[PDB]
Each structure stands twice: as structure tokens, then as C-alpha cells.
């Protein structure tokens, strides 16, 4: 046999695997939001609400393509129809 | 499209690379199902829009 | 010695098209249903045009032809009507037709867009597709030109004239990956992937599967608006089933009478 | 008007695409 | 003469889309986005609006009366 | 507000006391009971004690209010139930942030006794179902029961946002982010009053399903409103840990040194400061912070990683005795968390010649995903010798992964030919041919006799 080295340490190292791990945010079992109905001392229900376009975008789930229609392509023109004003 | 005769900015590789951006076979070929049986034709048919003329010689 | 037991899986359902998957069926059954969606599902369409006054720039039959191709809302009514050729009436019946009426005169100075708005139906349900987006342009009239006609819509199916075809386009597909080698690519990597391809971006086509049938037929039935895209399907299954029932009847007569 | 705009901003691409003249399928005469 | 009612190939209604298509060319669109915004996916239906020459506009100049 | 009037027996509403100073909560129960003040001023003064940032006086002054329910208030039972509602909801709210002198059950048993007495006057109200639903989150069971009790608040009188928010936390526990995301939308439209940044839980579900453009946008607003919240800042640290070659200063200073000085009792920022210092070869603080990141946490997700950091810092120091027990606790606490604890016990079981169990623990590494580093682990600790296809098949499939890729392979071709001597004799020869020349590029080193002897064999 060949005396292969026993992998008793880390020398690759495993830095490529530990940094890619997405650790979940479990700071509070209620997902960082207190579930209660007594604490809401203050309110923002009155007209001309405190809100921002940054907040507005966050209300949607998923809304956020084929961009090549508007390519130059020097060998491709545009179309022409029937006016009532010409030579 | 532009089909001027002697253009040389137009060739078939160039058209082909364009064609392949729309999700087609680069050469204009397609995979046809047979209309009677529904089975794929083992040959890939060349298919695309071409301008056709009706001539005055009706039967 | 008996039938296979198919399973259905609707992937996409809109008011314009249906995407569904049929599993565990023969290639022939899966295609014959496609033929029936196109040619053998009934719809209501204009098929009789009586032109009273036509002063437009087009012909007489041009008007009538364009009226033929306008889709009519059929779902609730089409499985009630007699075919025209089967109604006892000496002319037309509400049981065998829906009556239409176009009366348009350009009086104003501007040009008149004769649209499907102008087609006035006697039945409130069998209208052109206006309910809930512009309208099918029939003609354009000038200052003093007009168009008066009455029209009738009857039941028919796409085997007669394309006007009775309920579909935009039926997208049939099977075996997205070339597993059967039903098709033989000269260069299998020049080929883009199917919508349905259960394949990675490394390999080009599935490995050859010697013993194996088509299943998993991928459909994309697109309505012309004349029916709901999911009614086209229930109707075609019922149409094909009805042709076979009829066939069996005729068969049984042939058998016992020999 | 937009075809005038389109055709001038497109054909300058034959001056800008300077790095890769390589592809085959086109020829031209070179006499004497 | 006048935009067909249906794509000859597939059968999709394109008859209602011509005014809208010219309206999307009153906006600054490429024809490729005009066709897309109207929802014409197939290269059959897309030919109908690209290729339609509107001659009814010229025939309308030949007034009968007034 | 800050100076309210207290009713008296003669010429009431003439005395006011300032709320800026911090008085004793023992004399308040007497001054409100010698003059026979109405029940409304009790809750009115309680909220002003909670406005100053004091969670203890608000729950202690309202405890003695059960005795003086209806003495002479002429049928004032409605305000009494509203008082006891706080003693049935703030107990469960304070049980999660327990101190070091109290336990969990010490606040659970007080939240269960007075809740039955709260339902004697009015039952099944706007907030009474909130207590029954949140009772299940504290024990970790009966998830369907808590969701069915939260749905009842929409059909009785849903006059608040958090009235509905409770179902999304239960949808989150069953790994349903589609059902939770839809319910978190309603949270932002009203923009309700909550010091907890209700947007925080929304930004937590934006982490999944590849919405990195969304989660940042959630955290940012949260940071602008109140910088006191660390739950909006450490998330961006976890969103930025993947970039190890780019944006390192923001990830060790702006996202790790700021969250630590503002809130040092957090095991998440302590775990992340430890693993960041581990790459900089500063092990003197990793083991100091990981002991403090371990004793204050309760859920099994943070403690398995805190033990894993300790055994990783002990492994690199040739200290496997203390690190072996930490690697076992990392898998005994939380096994389905990540693949790291299974791989640490695999490389650990190599010690003391107990490499039998390293194969059993390394088997669960492939079930998630293979790795170019895990393939050589079982190949080195391969117990397959001959006519043993239960263990030689894994070595062949591991060797096919190192054969294609080139992570400076030096002994990979030796282990290739060491299996192929029983199989086709040309395969071992092809591996020795390339293994003979691969041992010459690093240095001028002659080939050891053990390879030339076997290639000639
Ligand atoms: Zn009739
Ligand atoms: Zn078409």
C-alpha cells in the first residue's frame, strides 16, 4: 500500500463551504414582531399617511425580459403605411 | 427585414445568430408533428414566412 | 385487452388559453383530440348574410366574408342549437340560429369605423366578443356611404369552414426530451430546449429509451373568444365520444343485420 | 423619421465592431 | 385592403388590433414591442400586423358624394 | 400625557404629578385607593409608565388592580376586563425575554391562572383568543390549534393589523413562506404603531425565494425609523457573509462591530464575529465569544453552531478531545440544520481509530449535496479491502469526482489504481502512468519505490 495521509486537520480549507451557508434569522420565535394588541399606543391611520416609495414597492409580492426587439441590426429597417400627405 | 442584393452586412450566419435569440433552430429548421397521426416527423422541416404570389392563371 | 387510464393536470388556466397535461394515453388518442379541437367542436358563427344596402369601398362578399370570421360567444347556447340542416323550420328558428343586424350610415365628416359594436344580436348571449380592448374592424365609411344588412348565425364546426374553428392555436407536444428518438437531430446541441424539458443545461437530448411509449402530452389550447378555452376541451372530448357512440350504433346494426 | 434615426445609429456599428472581422460567409474581389 | 379578421395560419383574431397597433406607433415604440404589447406571441399572427398594408385609407379618398 | 389630574373626594381634578421622575410603585396603589378614583385612571397612568420604557411597573401596578374591581364604581366591569387582559397577554410577551433569575414556567403558570378569571366577565373577545393562540408557540406543539384560534379574530371584530398577523407566524413554522408572505402585506398598508418594526418580520420572509432586492429594502426602512433595532442590521450581515473576497470591511466593522457595541447579549452577532475572526487567525476571541453566545440562547438553531465554532477552534489547535464532544452536541441539538456538523463529526471520528462511525456520519453529507472536499474524506477513511462492494462502490463514485476536477491532485491517482487491481488491469496501469509523472512538478523528487514496485507488479 501507499501511506496516504490521514485527514486529521483542515488544509483545503473548508472556508468555501462555511461562508456560503445562509443562516436563518431566528432572533425571536415571533419573527422579530411582537404579537399583541395592547402595545399599539400610537397610530398612522389619519389622511396624508407617513409612507415612502421604498415602502410602496414592498407591498407587492412579485412584479419586478426580451430586450432584443430594439437592436440596431444595420440590415433591418422599419415599416411604412398609408398617409394622406406625400410626393 | 432587408434583402437588398449586394449588401454583405447580411449573410446567413448573422441571420442565424439572430434567429437563435428567439428560441428557434439557428438554421430555420423545426420539429413538426404529423397532422394525421400526431407523431413527430423524423426529419426536421425547414419552415418560415415567405412571400407568395397568386398568378392570374386560375384553373 | 382493454383501455388505458389517463390523468390530467392543468398547468395554466386563463380566460384565453389552457395548458394541460395528459398522462397514460396512446399517441393516437392524444392527437385525435387535437384534430377535434380544430375541426369538430361546434361553435356559433355568422353564416348567412342578406345585404340590403352596401355603399362601402369594399365588395359585397368582402363584407359577408369578414362577418363570417367574427367570433361569437357560444358556451351557454351552442350545445342547445340544432344544426341548420336539421331544424324543421322552413327558413330559420331561434332553436337553429341567432339573428344579427347591422345598420350604419356615416353622416358626420370624419370616417366611420364599422366595428363589431354595430352587429346587433336578437339573443343577448350570442354576441361578438365585446363583454369585458378594441373591436373587430369590418369597414371604414366616408361621408355619405352606408351599410345595411341582416345576418344569421348558425351552428357549425371547423371541418366545413375555418370560421367555426374555436381555437387560436393548439400547442400539442410529447416527449420534450428526445427519449423515443421520434425525431433524429443531425446536431442535437443546435436545438433549443423545450418549455417542458426535464433536462439540465449540460446534455442535449435524453438518452435513448428503447422500450417505451409516448405519454405525457402537453397541450396549450388558445381560444378565439368564441368559447372559454377550457370549454373547447370538454366539448371536444364529448364530440369525439359522440362520434364513437354513433359509430358503435351503426356498427351494431351492421353486425346484427348480417 | 425614426427610420432615419434608426439607420444612422445602426450603420455606425460597422465602424464600432472593430475587434472581430473573422467570419467566413462573404467574399470580395481583389484584382492584380 | 383592410386588416384580416384572423391570422390566416393559426386563426387568432387580429382584426381588433390594427387601430391599437397604430396607436402604439403614435407612442415611440419599436414594432417589435408594439406586437408584443398587443400579445401576439406566434410568428404567424405577428406577420399580420407587420405586413398589413392599409389600402382602405386610400380607397376612402374616392368620395362618392361630398 | 405627562401631567394628568387625579380625582379626589372634594373638589376633584386639582392635583397633578409629573411623570418625568421615577417614583415608587408601592405608594401608587394606596393613593388610588384612599380617594376612590375611577377605574379608567388606572389604565391611563399605566400607559404613561409604559411610554417611558419600563416593562415591569406596567405589569406590577396592574396586578393589584384585581382586588379593587367593583367597590363603588357603579357597574364598571368593562374596564376591569381590559385591565386583566394585560395580565393575560403581557405575561406571555415577557416570558420570551426571560432574565437570569426567572424561568419560563414561572411566567407561564401566571399567564394560565388569570386568563380563566378574565373570561368570567367577557368571553371570546378581540384579544382573549390571542392568548390561547400564543400559548402554543411557547411549548412548541399544536400548530393547527393556534391557527384556528387566530382565524376567529377576523370573524368577531378585526379592528387592528396584529389581529391578523398571528396566522403568518404559524404559517412560518410549517415552512410555508407563500402563505406567510401574503399575510405580511397587510402589515405595511396601515403602517400600525409598534416599536418592534413590524416591517422586520416581512423582511425576514423576503430572505427566501430569491428576493434579495426586497429584503434590503425592508431592512433599510427599519434602520431609518429606529437604529436601535439590531434585527434589521444583523440580517444584512447574514446577507453579506457570502461575499468573502468583496466587501469585507463593511461585513466585519459596519455589520459586526456596530451590532456588537449596541447589543452585546446577542449570540447571532457573537457567532458571526467569531467566524469572521477565525479566518484572520485570532482564536483568542472565538472561544471567548462562543461561550457567551451559548448560555443565553434557548432554541436549538443557534446552540449547535456555537458548539461547532468551539470545536473548529479546538480542532485547528490539535485539541480534538474537547472538540469531539462539541461536534456531537452540534448534531445532537440540531441535526437537520446544515451539513456542517455531519462533516465535523466525520473528520473527528477519524481520531482514536474509530473511523467506522465517520462513514455513517459522512453518509448524510451526500444526501444534501456532494462536494469536492467530502469525496476525499470517505476515500481516505475507506474500509473497503477486497470482495467488498458495499464500501468499494462509494470509493469509485468519489474517485470519479476528483478525477475530472483538478484541485491540485497528487495522491488522487494512487487511490484510483488501488481499487482497479481487482478490476481491469489496464485501468490501474493508466493511473500509475499519470501518478508517476504527477509527483515531479512540485519538486525534483524521485518516485518512491512503493509505486514503481506495484506498477511493475
Ligand atoms: Zn330552424
Ligand atoms: Zn397567427
Q: Say yes or no for a CB contact (<8 Å) between A82 and E22.
A: no
In whole angstroms, give the CA distance from residue F190 to residue F183.
13
Torsional sign, CA A85, A87, B6, B8: negative
Burial of D1 (0-12, 13-18, 19+ CB in 10 A): exposed
| A12 grid coordinates | 483545503
Cα–Cα nearest to F363, from A17, F315, F349, F407: F349
- Burial of C132 from C-beta contacts in 10 A (0-12 / 13-18 / 19+): exposed
- Go through the domains of chain C in sequence order and give each one's CATH number: 1-42+163-258 (3.30.1360.10), 43-162 (2.170.120.12)
Question: What secondary structure does DSSP assign to F25-80, as a single string?
Answer: SSSHHHHTTTTT--THHHHHHHHHHHHTS-HHHHHHHTTGGGTTSSSSSSS-HHHH
The answer to whether residues E36 and A66 touch, using CB atoms and an 8 Å cutoff, is yes
List, as ranges, residues 1-32 from D with C-beta within 8 Å of A. Answer: 2-3, 6-7, 9-11, 13-14
Q: Are C169 and E11 inside 8 Å of each other by CB? A: yes
Nearest beta carbon to residue D3 from set A72, A73, A77: A77
**Contact at 8 Å (CB) between F163 and F183?**
no
Q: For residues F428 and F435, what is the distance between their CA atoms, to the nearest angstrom?
A: 10
- Residues C243 and C237: their CA atoms lie apart, in Å, by 10
Q: Cell numbers 462502490 label which residue? A: F393
Give the minimum alpha-carbon distance from A73 to chain E in angstroms, rounded to a whole number.
13
* H helix or E strand, kind and range, residue B46: strand B45-46
Whether residue E54 and residue A81 make contact (CB cut-off 8 A), yes or no, is yes
On whether any CB of chain A is under 8 Å from the CB of E19, the answer is no
In the block, which residue shows the cell 370573524?
Answer: F155
Q: How far is CA F343 from CA F23, F370, F392, in A?
A: 57, 12, 20
In angstroms, the Cα distances linking F455 to A1, A24, F440 are: 12, 52, 17
Q: Which of C5, C193, C172, C10 is nearest to B37 (CA)?
A: C172
What does DSSP assign to residue C116?
A: G
Q: C239 CA distance to ligand 1 centroid (A)?
A: 22
CA of F374 to the centre of ligand 1 (A): 79
Question: Closest Cα to residue E5, out of C149, C124, C134?
Answer: C134
Distance CA A43, CA A64 (A): 30
Q: Report the C-alpha gap between C232 and F423 in whole angstroms.
A: 61
**CA-to-CA distance for D22 and F204, rounded, in angstroms?**
52
Asked if the Cβ–Cβ distance from D13 to A74 is below 8 Å, we say yes
Cβ contacts of F294 within 8 Å, gap of 6 or more? F267, F303, F306, F307, F310
Binding residues of C: 87, 89, 93, 95-96
Ramachandran bin of B49, using left for φ above 0, alpha for ψ from -120 to 50, beta for the remaining angles: beta
User: C-alpha C192: how far from its chain's center?
Assistant: 29
Q: Do chains F and E touch (3 or more CB pairs under 8 A)?
A: no
Element (H, E) at E34: helix E31-37
N-to-C CA span, chain A: 94
What cell numbers appear for F388 in the block?
467488498
Contacts of E31 in chain A (CB under 8 A): 69, 78-79
Question: From the CA of E46, which ligand is nearest?
Answer: 2
- The set of cell numbers assigned to B43 is 426529419
CA distance B8 to chain C (A): 25
Q: Are F129 and F149 in contact (CB under 8 A)?
A: yes
Residues in chain A closer than 8 A to F321 (CB atoms): none
- Residue B29 and residue F94: Cα distance in Å, rounded? 70
Which one, of C223, C254, C257, lies nearest residue C75 by Cα?
C223
Exposure pattern of F12-40 as b/e (b: 16+ CB <10 Å)? eeeeeeebeeeeeeeebbeebeeeebebe
What ranges in C18-176 are assigned the alpha helix state H? 27-39, 61-69
Q: H helices of F263-339, where?
A: 267-279, 283-292, 300-315, 320-333
Backbone region of residue B23 per phi and psi (left: phi > 0; alpha: psi in -120 to 50; beta: other values): left
The closest ligand to the CA of E48 turns out to be: 2
Determine what percent of chain B falls in helix, strand and coil, rounding each to the nearest 5: 15, 10, 75
Distance between CA atoms of F297 and F269, rounded to whole angstroms? 12
Close Cβ partners of F456 (under 8 Å, ≥ 6 residues apart) = none
Question: Pairing state of beta strands C173-174 and C120-121?
Answer: unpaired
Residue of E19, E63, E66 with shortest CB distance to C137: E19
Q: Dihedral, CA atoms, F29, F35, F38, F39, nearest 10 degrees?
A: 20
End-to-end alpha carbon distance in chain B: 34
Q: F77-95 vs F40-51: helix axis angle to the nearest 10?
A: 30
Contacts of F343 in chain A (CB under 8 A): 14, 17
Cα-trace Rg, chain F: 31
- Burial annotation C56-70 (CB, 10 A radius, 16+ → b, else e): bbbeeebbbebbbbb
Q: Is the four-CA dihedral F136, F142, F147, F148 of positive or negative sign?
A: negative
Rg of chain E on CA atoms, in Å? 13
CB contact B18 to D (< 8 Å): no
Please tell me the distance from the alpha carbon of residue C69 to that of residue C67, in angstroms, as a whole number.
Answer: 6
Grid coordinates 353486425 are at which residue? Answer: C255
DSSP state string for C186-228: SSTTSSPPPTT----SS-SSPPP-SS-----EEEEEEE-SSS-
Q: Do E10 and C169 touch (CB under 8 A)?
A: yes
Ligand nearest to the CA of E10: 2
CA-to-CA dists, residue F236 to A53, B50, C186, F146, F420, angstroms: 21, 56, 51, 31, 50
Alpha-carbon span D27 to B35, nearest angstrom:
42
**Are the Cβ atoms of A74 and D3 closer than 8 angstroms?**
no
| A73 CA: distance to closest CA in chain B (Å) | 9
Resolution (A): 3.0
Method underlying the structure: cryo-EM
Query: Which of A2, A13, A35 best tests the F interface by mutation, with the highest count of F CBs <10 A?
Result: A35
Angle at E54 between CA E52 and CA E56, to 5 degrees: 140
- The three cell numbers of residue C244 are 364513437
Contact B16, B26 (CB under 8 A): yes
Collapse the DSSP code of C128 into the 3-class scheme (helix H, G, I; strand E, B; otherwise coil) and give the result.
strand
Helix (H) or strand (E) holding C137: strand C137-141
Q: Strand, helix or coil at F360?
A: helix
Question: Residue F83 class from Cβ within 10 Å (0-12 exposed, 13-18 middle, 19+ buried)?
Answer: buried
> Cell numbers of F182, please?
401574503
Q: How open is the CA angle F345-F347-F350, to the nearest 5 degrees?
A: 100
Angle formed at CA E42 by CA B25 and CA D1, multiple of 5 degrees: 95
Calpha distance F434→F441 (Å, rounded): 12
Helices F105-118 and F77-95: angle between axes, nearest 10 degrees = 160
For the CA of C168, the nearest ligand: 2
Rounded to whole angstroms, how far apart are CA atoms F122 and F114?
Answer: 13
Nearest chain B residue to D24 by CA distance is B13
Tell me if B18 and A77 make a contact (CB, 8 A cut-off): no
Residue from D13, A41, C213 nearest F86 by CA:
A41
Burial label, D19 (beta-carbon count in 10 A; 0-12, 13-18, 19+): exposed
Task: Inform me whether the C-beta atom of residue E18 falls under 8 Å from chain C C-beta atoms.
Answer: yes
Phi, psi of C29 (to 5 degrees): -70, -45
Cα separation, E35 vs E47, whole angstroms: 9
Rg (CA), chain B: 16
3-state secondary structure of F358: helix
Rounded CA-CA distance F70/F152 in Å is 30
Closest approach of chain D CAs to the CA of B35, in angstroms? 37
First-to-final CA distance of chain F: 96
Residue C139: which of C109, C162, C111, C101 has the closest Cα?
C111
Q: In terms of DSSP bridges, do strands C120-121 and C42-54 run parallel, antiparallel, or are they unpaired?
A: unpaired
User: Which ligand neighbours the alpha carbon of B49 most closely?
Assistant: 2
d(CA F322, CA F308): 11
Helix, strand, coil percent values for chain A (each to nearest 5): 15, 0, 85
The answer to whether the CB of C114 falls within 8 A of the CB of C138 is yes
> To 10 degrees, what angle do helices F300-315 and F340-349 make?
40
Residue ranges of chain C whose CB lies within 8 Å of a chain E CB: 55, 57-58, 62, 66, 69-71, 111, 113, 116, 129, 133-137, 139-140, 142-145, 162, 165, 167-169, 222, 224-225
Burial string for C166-188 (b: 16+ CB within 10 Å, else e) reads bbbbbbbbbbbbbbbebbebeee
C-alpha angle with apex C63: C62 to C69, nearest 5 degrees? Answer: 90
Task: Check E58 against A82: CB less than 8 A apart.
Answer: yes
C28 CA to middle of ligand 2, Å? 26
- Other CB atoms within 10 A of residue F418 CB: 21
Please give the Cα distance from C106 to C143 (Å, whole number). Answer: 5
Query: Are the C-beta atoms of F362 and F346 separated by less than 8 Å?
Result: yes
CB-based contacts of C164: which residues, under 8 Å, 6+ apart?
A: C42, C43, C45, C156, C157, C158
Cα of E4 to ligand 2 centre, how many Å?
A: 11
Buried b (16+ CB within 10 A) or exposed e, E39-63: ebebbbbbbbbbebebebbebbeee
Chain C residues inside the 8 Å CB shell of E15: 66, 69-70, 136-137
On chain A, the residues whose CB falls within 8 A of the CB of F221 are: 52, 54-55, 58
Distance between CA F186 and CA F155 in Å, rounded? 17
Binding residues of C for Zn(2+): 87, 89, 93, 95-96
Q: Is C47 helix (H, G, I), strand (E, B) or coil?
A: strand
Inter-chain contact A66–E36, Cβ cutoff 8 Å?
Answer: yes
Q: Is C159 on the interface with B (CB under 8 A)?
A: no
CA–CA distance, C227 with C125 (Å, rounded to integer): 12
Say how far apart CA F54 and CA F142 lie, in whole Å. Answer: 33
Rounded to an integer, what distance in angstroms lies between the CA atom of residue C152 and that of residue C92?
8
Show the CA angle centred on residue E28, arms to residues E27 and E29, nearest 5°: 95
Please answer yes or no on whether A73 and D10 come within 8 Å at the CB atom: yes
Residue F287, helix vs strand vs coil: helix
**Can you spell out the DSSP letters for D7-32?**
HHHHHTHHHH-TT-----S-------
CB atoms within 10 A of CB B13: 12
Q: Are F272 and F250 in contact (CB under 8 A)?
A: no
Q: What is the DSSP letter of F225?
A: H
- The H or E element spanning position C19 is strand C17-23
Q: Are C140 and E57 inside 8 Å of each other by CB?
A: yes
Chains C and E contact (Cβ–Cβ under 8 Å for 3 or more pairs): yes
Residues of B with Cβ-Cβ distance to D26 under 8 angstroms = 8, 11
Cα(C150) to centroid(ligand 1), Å: 17
Q: Do D14 and A74 touch (CB under 8 A)?
A: yes
Task: For D21, name the nearest residue in chain B, comparing CA atoms only.
Answer: B9
In chain F, residues preceding a discontinuity (C to N beyond 2.5 A) are none
Q: Cα dihedral angle (F74, F77, F82, F83), rounded to 10 degrees?
A: 70
Q: In which element (H, E) is residue F439 found?
A: none
Q: Is B10 on the interface with A (CB under 8 A)?
A: yes
What domains are there in chain E, each with its CATH number? 1-66 (1.10.10.60)
CB contact B23 to A (< 8 Å): no
Q: To which residue does cell 339573428 refer?
A: C99
Amino acid at each position: 500500500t501507499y501511506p496516504f495521509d490521514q485527514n486529521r486537520f483542515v488544509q483545503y480549507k473548508a472556508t468555501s463551504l462555511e461562508k456560503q451557508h445562509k443562516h436563518d434569522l431566528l432572533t425571536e420565535p415571533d419573527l422579530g414582531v411582537t404579537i399583541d394588541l395592547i402595545n399599539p399606543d400610537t397610530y398612522r391611520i389619519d389622511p396624508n399617511v407617513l409612507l415612502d416609495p421604498a415602502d410602496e414597492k414592498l407591498l407587492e409580492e412579485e412584479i419586478q425580459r426580451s430586450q432584443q426587439h430594439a437592436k440596431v441590426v444595420p440590415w433591418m429597417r422599419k415599416t411604412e403605411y398609408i398617409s394622406t400627405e406625400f410626393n | 427585414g432587408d434583402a437588398t442584393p449586394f449588401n454583405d452586412a447580411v449573410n446567413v450566419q448573422k441571420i442565424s445568430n439572430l434567429l437563435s435569440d428567439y428560441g428557434y433552430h439557428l438554421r430555420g429548421n423545426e420539429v413538426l408533428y404529423n397532422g394525421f397521426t400526431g407523431r413527430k416527423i423524423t426529419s426536421q422541416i425547414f419552415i418560415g414566412p415567405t412571400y407568395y404570389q397568386r398568378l392570374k392563371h386560375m384553373v | 385487452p382493454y383501455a388505458n387510464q389517463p390523468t390530467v393536470r392543468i398547468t395554466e388556466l386563463t380566460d384565453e388559453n389552457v395548458k394541460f397535461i395528459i398522462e397514460n394515453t396512446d399517441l393516437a388518442v392524444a392527437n385525435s383530440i387535437r384534430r377535434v379541437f380544430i375541426a369538430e367542436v361546434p361553435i356559433i358563427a355568422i353564416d348567412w348574410v342578406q345585404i340590403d344596402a352596401n355603399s362601402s369601398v369594399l365588395h359585397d362578399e368582402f363584407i359577408a366574408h369578414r362577418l363570417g370570421l367574427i367570433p361569437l360567444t357560444s358556451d351557454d347556447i351552442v350545445d342547445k342549437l340544432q344544426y341548420s340542416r336539421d331544424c324543421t323550420c322552413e327558413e330559420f328558428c331561434p332553436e337553429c340560429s341567432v339573428e344579427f343586424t347591422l345598420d350604419v350610415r356615416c353622416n358626420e365628416d370624419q370616417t366611420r369605423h364599422v366595428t363589431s359594436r354595430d352587429l346587433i344580436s336578437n339573443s343577448p348571449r350570442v354576441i361578438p366578443v365585446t363583454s369585458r380592448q378594441d373591436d373587430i374592424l369590418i369597414v371604414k365609411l366616408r361621408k355619405g356611404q352606408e351599410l345595411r344588412l341582416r345576418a344569421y348565425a348558425k351552428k357549425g364546426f371547423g371541418k366545413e369552414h375555418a370560421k367555426w374553428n374555436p381555437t387560436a392555436g393548439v400547442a400539442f407536444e410529447y416527449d420534450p426530451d428526445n427519449a423515443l428518438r421520434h425525431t433524429v437531430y443531425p446536431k442535437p446541441e443546435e436545438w433549443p430546449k423545450s418549455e417542458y424539458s426535464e433536462l439540465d443545461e449540460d446534455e442535449s437530448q435524453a438518452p435513448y429509451d428503447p422500450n417505451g411509449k409516448p405519454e405525457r402530452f402537453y397541450y396549450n389550447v388558445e381560444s378565439c373568444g368564441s368559447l372559454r378555452p377550457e370549454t373547447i376541451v370538454l366539448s371536444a372530448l364529448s364530440g369525439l365520444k359522440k362520434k364513437l357512440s354513433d359509430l358503435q350504433t351503426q356498427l351494431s346494426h351492421e353486425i346484427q343485420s348480417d | 423619421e425614426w427610420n432615419i434615426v434608426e439607420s444612422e445609429k445602426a450603420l455606425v456599428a460597422e465602424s464600432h465592431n472593430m475587434k472581430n472581422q473573422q467570419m467566413d460567409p462573404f467574399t470580395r474581389r481583389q484584382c492584380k | 385592403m383592410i386588416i384580416p379578421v384572423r391570422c390566416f395560419t393559426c386563426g387568432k383574431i387580429v382584426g381588433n388590433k390594427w387601430e391599437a397597433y397604430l396607436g402604439l406607433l403614435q407612442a415611440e415604440y419599436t414594432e417589435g414591442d408594439a406586437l408584443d404589447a398587443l400579445g401576439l406571441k406566434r410568428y404567424c399572427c405577428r406577420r399580420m400586423l407587420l405586413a398589413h398594408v392599409d389600402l382602405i385609407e386610400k380607397l376612402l379618398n374616392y368620395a362618392p358624394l361630398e | 400625557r405627562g401631567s394628568i389630574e387625579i380625582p379626589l373626594r372634594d373638589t376633584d381634578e386639582v392635583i397633578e404629578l409629573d411623570f418625568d421622575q421615577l417614583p415608587e410603585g408601592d405608594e401608587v396603589i394606596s393613593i388610588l385607593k384612599q380617594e376612590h378614583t375611577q377605574l379608567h385612571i388606572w389604565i391611563a397612568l399605566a400607559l404613561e409608565y409604559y411610554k417611558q420604557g419600563k416593562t415591569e411597573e406596567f405589569v406590577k401596578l396592574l396586578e393589584a388592580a384585581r382586588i379593587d374591581g367593583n367597590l363603588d364604581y357603579r357597574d364598571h366591569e368593562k374596564d376591569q376586563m381590559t385591565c386583566l387582559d394585560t395580565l393575560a397577554a403581557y405575561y406571555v410577551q415577557q416570558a420570551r425575554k426571560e432574565k437570569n433569575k426567572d424561568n419560563k414556567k414561572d411566567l407561564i403558570t401566571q399567564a394560565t391562572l388569570l386568563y380563566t378569571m378574565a373570561d368570567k366577565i367577557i368571553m371570546y373577545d378581540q384579544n382573549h383568543l390571542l392568548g390561547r393562540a400564543c400559548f402554543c408557540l411557547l411549548e412548541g406543539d399544536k400548530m393547527d390549534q393556534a391557527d384556528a384560534q387566530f382565524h376567529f379574530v377576523l370573524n368577531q371584530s378585526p379592528n387592528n393589523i396584529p389581529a391578523l398577523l398571528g396566522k403568518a407566524c404559524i404559517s412560518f413554522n410549517k415552512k410555508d413562506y407563500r402563505g406567510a408572505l401574503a399575510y405580511y402585506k397587510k402589515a405595511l398598508r396601515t403602517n400600525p404603531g409598534c416599536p418592534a418594526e413590524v416591517r422586520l418580520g416581512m423582511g425576514h420572509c423576503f430572505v427566501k425565494l430569491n428576493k434579495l432586492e426586497k429584503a434590503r429594502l425592508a431592512f433599510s426602512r427599519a434602520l431609518e425609523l429606529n437604529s436601535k433595532c439590531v434585527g434589521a442590521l444583523v440580517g444584512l450581515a447574514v446577507l453579506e457573509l457570502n461575499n468573502k473576497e468583496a466587501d469585507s470591511i463593511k461585513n466585519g466593522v459596519q455589520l459586526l462591530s456596530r451590532a456588537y457595541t449596541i447589543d452585546p447579549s446577542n449570540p447571532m452577532v457573537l457567532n458571526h464575529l467569531a467566524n469572521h475572526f477565525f479566518f484572520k487567525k485570532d482564536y483568542s476571541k472565538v472561544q471567548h465569544l462562543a461561550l457567551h453566545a451559548f448560555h443565553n440562547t434557548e432554541v436549538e438553531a443557534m446552540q449547535a453552531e456555537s458548539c461547532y465554532q468551539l470545536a473548529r477552534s479546538f480542532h485547528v489547535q490539535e485539541d480534538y478531545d474537547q472538540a469531539f464532544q462539541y461536534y456531537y452536541q452540534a448534531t445532537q441539538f440540531a441535526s437537520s440544520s446544515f451539513v456542517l456538523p455531519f462533516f465535523g463529526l466525520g473528520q473527528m471520528y477519524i481520531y482514536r481509530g474509530d473511523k467506522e462511525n465517520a462513514s455513517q456520519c459522512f453518509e448524510k453529507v451526500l444526501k444534501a449535496y456532494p462536494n469536492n472536499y467530502e469525496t476525499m474524506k470517505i476515500l481516505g477513511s475507506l474500509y473497503a479491502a477486497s470482495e467488498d462492494q458495499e464500501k468499494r462502490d462509494i470509493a469509485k463514485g468519489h474517485l470519479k469526482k476528483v478525477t475530472e476536477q483538478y484541485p491540485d491532485d497528487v495522491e488522487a491517482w494512487i487511490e484510483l489504481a488501488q481499487i482497479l487491481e481487482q478490476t481491469d488491469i489496464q485501468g490501474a496501469l493508466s493511473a500509475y502512468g499519470t501518478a508517476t509523472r504527477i509527483l515531479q512538478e512540485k519538486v525534483q523528487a524521485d518516485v518512491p519505490p512503493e509505486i514503481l514496485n506495484n506498477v511493475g507488479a
